[PDB]
């Protein structure tokens, strides 16, 4: 067969493509306005919504007809979205090309590897999931110098769309679960994995859904405000921007480190702790946000907690319901993050504008993270289902 570490590289490739898709709009804000920032951000909001919703059908189709078809279709759709975003002329044009097509393909690329990589690593599920999701923290590090090299804009859309289509087709080409019988390794009761209908009907699934929505919303609601908070406190734009930039490093690193850490010690308490820490960070920025060092610390903590969500929620869902229906279960679960990605940033901006001050959005995010802390800490796994219909066999 093939080594079980190959799916990790595949998910790295696919998630890196998705990260390039998500990082594109920030590089395009200035060039596109050259020919309103909020008008541009509407395309990104559409992209987030489409992405986060298309995970659900992507997960169902991955569970039904395998993940290769889904990821490669996603690569086609995204590549089309980017290459067509390159040939745009109107606002709605970019909305469709980037937000819808590219977002569609991006969701279809993102989900199947998150579902597949743990299947090869039953001994290290959270780490493998982290490899399936760590590419999104990379999009900035690879694209930003690349995008600057191309511009210093349509060239970015076209060539990046080609490269992303290629990486996604490579990742999806070699992507498939292990064979049904044997699992890569080095009268009784027979348990079994939950069905998608059994998981979707479970109450803890929606407690996790609610926690996910809250965490994603709070993070997306304040991250855009971190550097503006620093400038309001008295820092120079350069200093505040430098301070907030460490959030990318922590957001990327946490996806692998938290995965490995909970593989070793368990999910629930570390996860709840990270949420608590995010709560404290939303509150603490008011004391630490006015100096490069303090603002950097808050950005790192926000990045760590936020990023950890995207390993720990799929790892938690895998713990609860098992991996056979993980495509459907986590695809459904991720739509929470899709909705938050649509609405959260706008709400943060609106609250700040409404009051003129940062207390309201940060305090609202702290409340959401408190709720998430409570849910994540108090939710223990459900009863492992038994296959009585398979149990009967031991005479
Ligand atoms: C952003 C917050 C969104 C919270 C959504 C909570 C949904 C709770 C009600 O849903 C229903 O729950 C049943 C089992 O509990 C399922 O059988 C059913 O399919 C589902 O429709």
Author numbering: 7 to 41, 45 to 161, 167 to 200, 212 to 420
Give excerpts from the publication:
We have identified a transporter from Syntrophobacter fumaroxidans (SfMCT) that shares 25 and 27% amino acid sequence identity, and 51 and 57% sequence similarity with the human SLC16 family L-lactate transporters MCT1 and MCT4. In summary, we reported two structures of the bacterial SLC16 homologue SfMCT in complex with the monocarboxylates TSA and L-lactate. We have presented the structures of an L-lactate transporter (SfMCT) with two different bound ligands. Both structures show SfMCT in the pharmacologically relevant outward-open conformation, which is an essential prerequisite for the design of L-lactate transport inhibitors using SfMCT structure-based homology models of human MCT1 and MCT4.
To understand the binding mechanism of L-lactate that bound to the purified, detergent-solubilized transporter with a Kd of 2.84 ± 0.15 mM, we co-crystallized SfMCT with its transported substrate. Two molecules of L-lactate (i.e., Lac1 and Lac2) were found in the binding pocket (see also Supplementary Fig. 5c,d for electron density and omit maps). The carboxylate group of Lac1 interacts with the Nη nitrogen atoms of the guanidinium group of R280 (TM8), while the hydroxyl group is hydrogen bonded to the hydroxyl group of Y119 (TM4). Furthermore, the carboxylate group of Lac1 is in hydrogen bonding distance to the hydroxyl group of Lac2. As observed for TSA, the Lac1 carboxylate group is sandwiched in the confinement formed by the side chains of L145 (TM5) and F335 (TM10). The phenyl-ring of F359 (TM11) points towards Lac1 with a distance of 3.4 Å between the C4 carbon atom of the benzene ring and the methyl-group of Lac1. Most residues involved in ligand binding adopt similar conformations in the SfMCT structures with bound TSA and L-lactate. The exception is L28 (TM1), which is rotated away from the central cavity in the presence of L-lactate. This removes the binding site obstruction observed in the presence of TSA and generates space to accommodate Lac2. Neither Y119A nor the conservative mutation Y119F showed any [14C]L-lactate transport, which is in line with our observation that the hydroxyl group of L-lactate interacts with the hydroxyl group of Y119 (TM4).
